[PDB]
Design a protein around this ligand. Structure first.
Ligand SMILES: Nc1ncnc2c1ncn2[C@@H]1O[C@H](COP(=O)(O)OP(=O)(O)O)[C@@H](O)[C@H]1O
Ligand SMILES: [Mg+2]
Lengths: 187, 186
């Protein structure tokens, strides 16, 4: 996003400007359901762009930059990476599994992380996975409204379980075992 | 008739000292720790003592059955005893007498479990339980020929897990004066 704001004219360089542009992406970005048609209709720039108030006071006006910078997730070649997008790596990971559990994995896609809070990412991901996968079974994507803190919610749920107290790494055990006890026990 | 030599067990918090009666030194003085996993079944892939110590990063996780002198986990203790008896001590349980020792102030439940394990899992001819101290008073006197036994004193037994200050007067141990500090070499 910092790189593509330069072509618009506005220059952000230092770390403070990096935080500023992160704040910009926080609330002025989304994932388009379709990419080519959205870029085509961005030519008639009517309902796409909308201004943002920079901390200084001058106003920013970003058009196709709103949905171009989150598109890099599905097209990693934008930043120069020979890697498949998230929509394709999910299908690849599913195909890496056994032939029986794939049907259950298709209908249970748990979105997580703070990056996945883009308004309109679940729909695009579901469409892409449906296109990739065979057309018979249904593809269901799960986007809880609180998925921003999903990892912490799961950690708190796991911590208050009776079986869990036996899975800790007690201080005495670490003292007698060295730092490799975490590899011994945790995973 | 002529019985076999009694066997002197010892299960300390840090070190276990096996041996025989009449010997001038314990046959084995090795740490009270057992290695355990988590085509031999997982029932038998366990090592104890120095073998367990050397085989620490090869795929085993060490664990100390005894802490503060009282045994918490029982699988480790019973496996430790069977490994000792049938691997290092090399004795048949049914034709020997054992002299187990364990620190005072232990729950009666621990003694009951020890007795039932010894007389069911192994079922030796006989089992005797003595207090870690006492033996200390017995070994105090060096030139113990016929008479020169002190038989009256105080034994300050400080070890790895717990220390005990036990007074003895004319052989009998005065219970009301027994006090124990829960700090030791560990
Ligand atoms: N030379 C020493 N000086 C001080 N402490 C020692 C020395 N040797 C061993 N220790 C510690 O004192 C403990 C007492 O030894 P021992 O009586 O065999 O143990 P336990 O109390 O478990 O039966 C040892 O386990 C060790 O931690
Ligand atoms: Mg001791």
């Amino acid at each position: 996003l910092m790189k593509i704001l330069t072509e618009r004219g506005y220059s952000f360089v230092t770390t403070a400007e990096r935080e500023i542009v992160r704040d910009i992406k926080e609330k002025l970005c989304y994932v388009a359901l379709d990419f080519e048609n959205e870029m085509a209709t961005a030519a008639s720039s009517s309902s796409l762009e909308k201004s943002y108030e920079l901390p200084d006071g001058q106003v920013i006006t970003i058009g196709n930059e709103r949905f171009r910078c989150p598109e890099t997730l599905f097209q990693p070649s934008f930043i120069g990476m020979e890697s498949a997008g998230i929509h394709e790596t999910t299908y690849n990971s599913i195909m890496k599994c056994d032939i029986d559990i794939r049907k259950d994995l298709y209908a249970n896609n748990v979105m997580s992380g703070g990056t996945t809070m883009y308004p309109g990412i679940a729909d695009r991901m579901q469409k892409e996975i449906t296109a990739l996968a065979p057309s018979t079974m249904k593809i269901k994507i799960i986007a809880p409204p609180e998925r921003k803190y999903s990892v912490w919610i799961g950690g708190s749920i796991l911590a208050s379980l009776s079986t869990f107290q036996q899975m800790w790494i007690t201080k005495q055990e670490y003292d007698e075992a060295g730092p490799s006890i975490v590899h011994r026990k945790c995973f | 008739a002529s019985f076999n030599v009694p066997i002197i067990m010892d299960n300390g918090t840090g070190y276990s000292k096996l041996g025989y009666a009449g010997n001038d030194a314990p046959s084995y003085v090795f740490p009270t720790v057992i290695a355990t996993r988590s085509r031999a079944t997982e029932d038998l892939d366990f090592f104890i003592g120095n073998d367990a110590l050397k085989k620490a990063s090869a795929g085993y996780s060490l664990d100390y059955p005894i802490r503060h002198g009282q045994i918490e986990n029982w699988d480790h203790m019973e496996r430790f005893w069977q490994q000792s008896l049938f691997k290092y001590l090399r004795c048949e349980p049914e034709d020997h007498y054992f002299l187990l020792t364990e620190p005072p102030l232990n729950p009666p439940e621990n003694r009951e479990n020890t007795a039932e394990i010894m007389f069911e899992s192994f079922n030796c001819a006989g089992l005797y339980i003595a207090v870690q101290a006492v033996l200390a008073l017995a070994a105090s006197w060096t030139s113990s020929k016929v008479t020169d036994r002190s038989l009256t004193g105080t034994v300050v037994d400080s070890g790895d897990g717990v220390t005990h200050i036990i007074p003895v007067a004319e052989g009998y141990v005065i219970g009301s004066s027994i006090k124990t500090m829960p700090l030791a070499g560990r």
